[PDB]
């Protein structure tokens, strides 16, 4: 996932209401533009800071790649790049110049969105390097974190998995039954679900046994699992939907002997609100532990 | 959603272990029997009772239409080659602990058996064919005999499949529709999973899960009220056609286990086992007024999504 900083000093109102970003494709003199070319580098899931009227008004999430589209009609008045941007207004609408002594050390030598004095540069879309991105996020506060962790940063993972499902569904060589089972297993259906039900009986965390209230979740994700692992009843848990949400995204994981592990970026208010207690949720078998190790080391959100 | 009855006789274990059903597709002359043709009528999400050794052993959910596939095991007598090509269905088995013996309840079942093509004779002996249709009234009686385990498989689970199938087909149609504005297309598709302009607009009128109180954006699902699939394009992108919900509340609401009155009073379905609310520490009660714009959609939800009767 990449971060971008978009300077909309004079266009924000219109771009926010329409849920987009727009720029020309090239310079007036016909040459390639580093800054316009930034638009073609944006991927769904990427985080975009809206900088307008001196303020960061939104921490947004890109929902498209750049697509060719007509310049927006403005009242009283050639195709450019459009990006669908899912705006998220933040309560803490900050002015970056005020924190420049803290920010300056982490500004890039070239293509910086801010000058060394704290004033903005005059391009439209800047890349924000990852160290700097975290500093901006620090200043906005936890609401920027709400946009990112387990939200914006899940999108690229879903994109990758969507493409793996496409590779399988369109594979003209793979056995038809195998195709169906691998695809259905992604959403906890098919032989994977039946096999899991012979290993697990209930949601570890909430105790619910009712099959219509449980999600068949993989431990090692479906996307990175090989075909055996995708259909292995030992590579799963039956979880209540809110617990599936926390586990799938790596807000929680488990020790081999059952203790729930919590990510640094899980807000503890959530667990309080849903009456999920910390503690031990039972031994995992040796076969399950193989997968849970993978989850701890690759899915669980750990800086 | 339709119900079926598969008489698996002495090969339940192999068909269970393989997660399938298999039948011939035709007689030698190209004609189908009624029972071979039944395989071609099964749709994903349909419920299939596995009957073997006189017992109902599984309440399964079909996960495919019938597809051409070679006979999974050998015939008892080395048969003709044409007969090896049949219909396969991927069946998601769900074992039940309460294994009903239909013949021991024949007096209760007999009145609801069909005049023709029935899975059972009037004395409760099974018929010779493989896949039988179970009409809906007969199905309800079978479910009553099996009890809550059957209900668990069906309501909010098997019966959600056809709704997902429809929503998937619609997304495909929209995505490939050349006549739609490119930006509109992207917005309509993203809105299905609570993304894009729909979510930003919902955030202008709602701020938290009303049921759990959670305000954190990364722990909320942007749900529609009137479902995305049945909504028109204005309704799909309307921020008033939504609620922010914790994932488990999104689950209960989307499937119609709960709904809300216009003043926010939570309505709980008779199909909701109240143990679930206790296990997840969710209270009944009042969750605040909706706006007139939201009430339009909530009325639809109460009348068409909420599980009644
Ligand atoms: Cl050039
Ligand atoms: Cl460039
Ligand atoms: Cl400030
Ligand atoms: Cl200010
Ligand atoms: Cl840049
Ligand atoms: Cl297994
Ligand atoms: Cl461990
Ligand atoms: Cl016939
Ligand atoms: Cl076929
Ligand atoms: Cl008959
Ligand atoms: Cl008879
Ligand atoms: Cl019999």
Residue numbers in the entry:
A (entry chain B): 1 to 77, 84 to 309
B (entry chain A): 1 to 309
Text lifted from the article:
The crystal form without DNA was phased experimentally. Except for the weaker diffracting crystals of VcaM4I with dsDNA, the resolution of the data reached around 1.5 Å. Although crystals without DNA, with ssDNA, and with dsDNA grew in different space groups, the protein conformation was remarkably similar in all structures, with the exception of two loops in proximity of the DNA (residues 24–34 and 72–84). In all crystal forms, the protomers dimerize via the HNH domains. The extensive interface area of 2000 Å2 (equivalent to 4000 Å2 of buried surface) and the classification of the interface as stable by the PDBePISA server suggest that the dimerization mode in the crystals is relevant in solution. The DNA binding site of the C-terminal HNH domains is consistently empty in all structures. The dimer of HNH domains alone is crescent-shaped and could accommodate dsDNA (∼20 Å in diameter). The VcaM4I alone and with 11-mer duplex generated scattering profiles that indicated ‘compact’ structures judging from the Kratky plot. At low concentration, the scattering data for VcaM4I and its complex with dsDNA were well modelled by the crystallographic structures (for the enzyme alone, with dsDNA bound to one EVE domain, or the mixture model).
